[PDB]
Amino acid sequence: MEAIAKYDFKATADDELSFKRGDILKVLNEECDQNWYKAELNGKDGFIPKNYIEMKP
């Protein structure tokens, strides 16, 4: 799916990854935390919060 960073984000742990308000993210799974999505960016993959992004199913 398609994802779009809405606000800037700064990872807090090893399993999370950063972005900046505007990144085009690759949603690689979403079934484990209603509040987080696993997506791809910048040659990495990690958790990001859903209230910081907007999907584009």
Binding site: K6, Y7, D8, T12, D33, P49, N51, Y52
Partner: peptide
């Protein structure tokens, strides 16, 4: 001012 990030870790 962005939103309060969810508590990660269910």
């Amino acid at each position: 001012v962005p939103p309060p990030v969810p508590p990660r870790r269910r």
